[PDB]
């Protein structure tokens, strides 16, 4: 028996799987406080808790550095994402759209709405978001408008080549793209309050 109509199941399954991804990234064993803080942040589109001071920058480096060798998703972490989202046997295009929507979510985490501020942004979350986007590009370049748009978003995440850095705008831009081209995948990933 399905307790939810088909088109509404995403509203329950999505938050479940996002929580499982948060448990993978932020182990309750070593990072229980930050784990809770990342979960609590999904409950509204504004956060008074910020992670931009030197200590928070250090804490997040501890967490994400092992996941991002050479600035890219580790093979092991990428497999863990696939398992959590039941994508091990899925098409590269479905995998890419999912990773793109996760990139968008972590762009939002880094933005002025959540753990960033107007003038500052937790770099580890920006790096994680850009690596998710890089993997999506490798899996299916065609889900992006162009290689130029990929490079623009990527340069914005890293602050390269004179690009603007505001991740509220970066996240809004990628979210608009996902809403246009794969809104059901987006609905399956983005925290409800952030949609």
């Amino acid at each position: 028996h399905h307790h939810h109509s088909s088109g509404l199941e995403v509203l329950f399954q999505g938050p479940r799987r996002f929580g499982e991804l948060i448990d993978i990234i932020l182990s309750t064993e070593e990072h229980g406080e930050l784990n809770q803080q990342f979960l609590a942040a999904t409950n509204q589109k504004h956060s008074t808790v910020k992670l931009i001071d030197d200590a928070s920058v250090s804490r997040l480096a501890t967490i994400f550095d092992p996941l991002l060798p050479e600035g890219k998703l580790s093979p092991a972490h990428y497999q863990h994402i696939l398992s959590a989202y039941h994508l091990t046997d899925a098409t590269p295009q479905k995998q890419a759209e999912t990773l793109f929507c996760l990139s968008t979510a972590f762009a939002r985490y880094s933005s002025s709405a959540i753990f960033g501020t107007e003038h500052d942004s937790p770099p580890a979350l920006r790096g994680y978001a850009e690596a998710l986007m890089q993997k999506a590009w490798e899996l299916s370049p065609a889900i992006f408008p162009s290689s130029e748009q990929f490079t623009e978003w990527s340069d914005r995440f890293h602050g390269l080549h004179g690009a603007f850095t505001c991740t509220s705008v970066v996240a809004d831009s990628m979210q608009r793209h996902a809403r246009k081209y794969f809104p059901s995948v987006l609905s399956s990933i983005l925290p409800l309050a952030w949609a």
Binding site: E70, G71, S112, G116, H119, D120, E130, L160, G162
Partner: protein
Amino acid sequence: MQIFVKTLTGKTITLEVEPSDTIENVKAKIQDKEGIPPDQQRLIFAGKQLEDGRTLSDYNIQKESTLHLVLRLRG
């Protein structure tokens, strides 16, 4: 010699430098590779912020050392 410059977002830049190169020169080589204006670059080594007018050798920076590049990244 070769040094590495790693942003806090995980982007690594490889540079060819001499111990006598100044921090300003390194920022200019970073601009040539990645287009970041030098006045927006904050370079860190051994927890110390590197000063424009000093040389790499003044900070005991050796071959294959990694410098950290801190950029103001807006949310």
